[PDB]
Design a protein around this ligand. Sequence first.
Ligand code: B12
Ligand code: SF4
Ligand code: SF4
Ligand SMILES: [Cl-]
Ligand code: NA
Length: 701
Amino acid sequence: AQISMRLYSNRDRPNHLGPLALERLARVDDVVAQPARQPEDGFAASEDSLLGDVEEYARLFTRFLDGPVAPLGDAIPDDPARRAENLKASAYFLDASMVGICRLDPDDRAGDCDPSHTHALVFAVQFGREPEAGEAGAEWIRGTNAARTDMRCAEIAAILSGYVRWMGFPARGHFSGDAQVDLARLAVRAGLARVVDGVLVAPFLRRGFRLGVVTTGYALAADRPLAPEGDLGETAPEVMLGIDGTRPGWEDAEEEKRPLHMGRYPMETIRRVDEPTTLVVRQEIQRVAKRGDFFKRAEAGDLGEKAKQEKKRFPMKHPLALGMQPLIQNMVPLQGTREKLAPTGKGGDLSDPGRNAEAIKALGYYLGADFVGICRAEPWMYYASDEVEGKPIEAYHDYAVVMLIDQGYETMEGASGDDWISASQSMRAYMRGAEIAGVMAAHCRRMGYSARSHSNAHSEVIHNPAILMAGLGEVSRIGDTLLNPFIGPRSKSIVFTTDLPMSVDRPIDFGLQDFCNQCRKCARECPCNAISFGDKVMFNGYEIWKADVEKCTKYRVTQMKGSACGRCMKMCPWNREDTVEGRRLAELSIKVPEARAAIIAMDDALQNGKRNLIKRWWFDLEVIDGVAGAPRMGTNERDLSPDRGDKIGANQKLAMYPPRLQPPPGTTLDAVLPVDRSGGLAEYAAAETPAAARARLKSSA
Ligand code: B12
Ligand code: SF4
Ligand code: SF4
Ligand SMILES: [Cl-]
Ligand code: NA
């Protein structure tokens, strides 16, 4: 029934080409400049609207369009064609819609622009889809598209300019809200648009778009403008069908037939159940100090000196991740309120919780979420106490809005999972989520409903049980990661809590317990053997495959041949391309139990998980002592591993750290609690089986 996905794989298409067939458009060497403006919204935004909130995050991102420049090291590639590919691939990684590069002339440097800048990276972001007339949340969104899309342009320009600054080259970001150059002119010269009746028109971006620019003296290979008159070739048969793995020409129209609140993926086709597919015993779940998060344990010294020394650095070794850091850290003060608010009367009719749910979903999809779900924020989902002052955390809000951001299939295909780009994949998703949820929570507060977002930089809730209760994933063998039937385990979640009354979603059942029970690929491929090859256990009141969080923490924080790790997400059979056959393999896994073992086995026989060298678009750069250079100890380039054989389930002994082996509630980062590994190993051997738990509970039912 869903026929918008691609027929053809993009496995041989380098990332710098992007998802659109820009290389098949008619181009010429030069065009005559003419006056032009960016697309704008058709209607005006009310005070019920989100406008003030996206404007605030744009202003925040504006502070990072310029910054300090690092010292130039010895490891930046000289070739401007290679530089151009890398930087275009970077923009597409950050979800630019269309990217091009041009030279800056003297008339461009005659304004406030740095006279050393000779090149411009120009990118467009397409307008978001908006709800139709009469749909829930239409008043929240109408008239906000240029400001919403400007926000995303500032964000991307700030990250990319900061990335070039960390490589040792001055660079400045620009967008409508703060520009030293003529954006519309540069968009024409870089080949993204043409002028129609004084307004820019971009092939393929039929909803409208906004522009961002990074100017720099980092020399880049330039592009050519579009042929100025006549048909560009956007509906040629190779383009329409997406032969090279590009977006099919009918996808826009087909997508617009789904209500915005339903998302892009057909989650309405997955079975719902009232209780999760795995046992949750709420009366037996103890709340955990934030100080027990194993990154906080590492920071405090619980895992030894090396882990402590590397804690702040480990995800910020690559210059691209360093470009994101300022945005991530400075969104934290904007996360929101814990105190009750009074309804303000803004936001339209909020009396139907079913419609409030649809409005919130539409809002998340508009802003860029891949999935949106809603659950009750149960008290046991909040941490017991904060790690800084040690004060109790209250269960202050009623609902959790959970959103998933796809970490990116095509980048992960090129990667080892634990190489130089790994943490940049995590941070992009963390950054994008934090932005979306910050805006959404601010809108709730505008309507007089208390709301706070919960980011990688500062959460007061554990995301996992909210992902489970919101019906966005099932418990997987990976352990501390939940798996979605369409994007697999390839996601970062963001949560914001709120008091806005909403209908809640239900847990999902797509057969994963049976599937993971017959598969061991993640376990086999984990560089530190942290994933369980055995059966599910009870842990702090719930059934789970408990990974060894001490082993995984130490590997991610301290391994030196990349930046952190997410290899388990890469190796999973459910991590697949968004094509007709890929979707079909997932459908079969869901609908046909007798096919699962074959799918599991063929995933290895066909070498899924092999590194695709065409997709390796990033530079292997490690910042040490403030300077980018070649990796000091090398780079992980892992391939598929052989079996551990047949008895590994019975032989592997992992350590678990339920509340009794954690720093108690009220413990702060000022105290040290050496991790009790021998006790955690014994605790795992003593864990109740889920069968025994069900038997025990039944005797009190
Ligand atoms: C610290 C941390 C880690 C640490 C330490 C985890 C720990 N247990 O201390 C380590 C290094 C192990 C880790 C690893 C990774 N993590 Co991590 N991490 C966190 C973080 C920031 C805090 C977790 C926490 O507080 N743990 C301390 C206590 C609560 O741990 P716990 O008692 O052992 O409980 C864990 C689970 O059992 C589960 N949980 C708790 N209560 C309940 C109840 C039920 C019913 C269920 C089903 C589960 C569940 O949540 C906890 C996750 O650590 C969260 C984000 C967040 N705020 O939740 C993510 C988070 C869990 N990580 C995530 C991911 C993706 C990863 C990696 C894949 C790394 C990467 N490249 O992205 C790996 C996966 C490791 C694995 N095998 O599963 C995602 C998972 C998303 C998803 N799809 O489910 C999260 C939610 C971050 C995010 N916003 O997306 N991470
Ligand atoms: S790799 Fe196999 S076992 Fe591990 S999570 Fe994916 S499907 Fe489950
Ligand atoms: S469990 Fe940790 S170390 Fe193992 S693959 Fe996953 S992220 Fe890497
Ligand atoms: Cl994590
Ligand atoms: Na795969």
